[PDB]
Design a binder for this molecule. Structure first.
Ligand SMILES: CC1(C)CCN(Cc2ccc(C(=O)NC[C@]3(O)CCCN(c4cc(NCc5ccccc5)ncn4)C3)c(O)c2)CC1
Length: 202
């Protein structure tokens, strides 16, 4: 249901079974790679998220860094995906120049597959993004274009997004979103039923 939708919530506690199935899931988690930042999930919390109910056939896009390069592979496998690709984003300035043992010129995004997705435009884009580091901790807007060309029109879901990530054809989840904005009638129905007083607790 085309326009941007979102739910401000604690992704640990949302009953995501109300949301339906998605052709693409994207996640950019607050990994515990530093227990400092306000919203960090522990490794068990990451592992224990109910990603498996969100899709039957389609793709998962999982931003990873540091030791989450390993842990995200683990979660991806535990959640029932095979990792079939890996996108890297080469971070440049506005003049197209690049930005422990080595300085880091790129972010990594894992691509996992579940089931047998049919009718996707595999092979349209290459596994390398080149884009300007806009704000810190922002992901490049180009990922949505690649995902839309890969699976045009389909329903998509982002976990741990921020208000700037809300997109048409996407439902965005995070705890710094402005309230709850839903328009897909099926989703609105199930949300009112699961959450008749609009609170998302426990
Ligand atoms: C360079 C990259 C392409 C790759 C790496 N990237 C790192 C990055 C940076 C920033 C964020 C971020 O700012 N995300 C929005 C949050 O709001 C922030 C706080 C948490 N967060 C929750 C957390 C949540 N439950 C857990 C909870 C625990 C304790 C207290 C309250 C909640 N439920 C719902 N959202 C999500 C982000 O996701 C990943 C950057 C881009």
């Amino acid at each position: 249901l085309f326009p941007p939708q979102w739910i401000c919530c604690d992704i640990r506690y949302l009953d995501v079974s109300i949301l339906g199935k998605f052709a693409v899931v994207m996640a950019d988690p607050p990994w515990d790679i530093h227990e400092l930042p306000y919203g960090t999930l522990t490794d068990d919390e990451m592992r224990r998220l109910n990603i498996p109910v969100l899709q039957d056939d389609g793709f998962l896009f999982l931003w990873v860094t540091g030791r989450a390069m390993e842990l995200g592979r683990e979660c991806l496998n535990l959640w029932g995906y095979e990792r079939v690709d890996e996108i890297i984003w080469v971070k440049t300035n506005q003049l197209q120049r690049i930005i422990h043992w080595l300085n880091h010129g790129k972010e990594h995004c894992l691509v996992g597959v579940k089931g047998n997705p049919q009718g996707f435009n595999q092979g349209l884009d290459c596994d390398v993004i080149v884009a300007e580091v806009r704000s810190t901790s922002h992901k490049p807007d180009e990922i949505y274009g690649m995902i839309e060309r890969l699976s045009p029109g389909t329903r998509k879901i982002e976990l741990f997004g921020r208000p700037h990530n809300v997109q048409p054809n996407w439902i965005t989840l995070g705890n710094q979103l402005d309230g709850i904005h839903l328009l897909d009638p099926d989703v609105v129905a199930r949300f009112k039923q699961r959450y008749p007083d609009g609170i998302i607790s426990k």
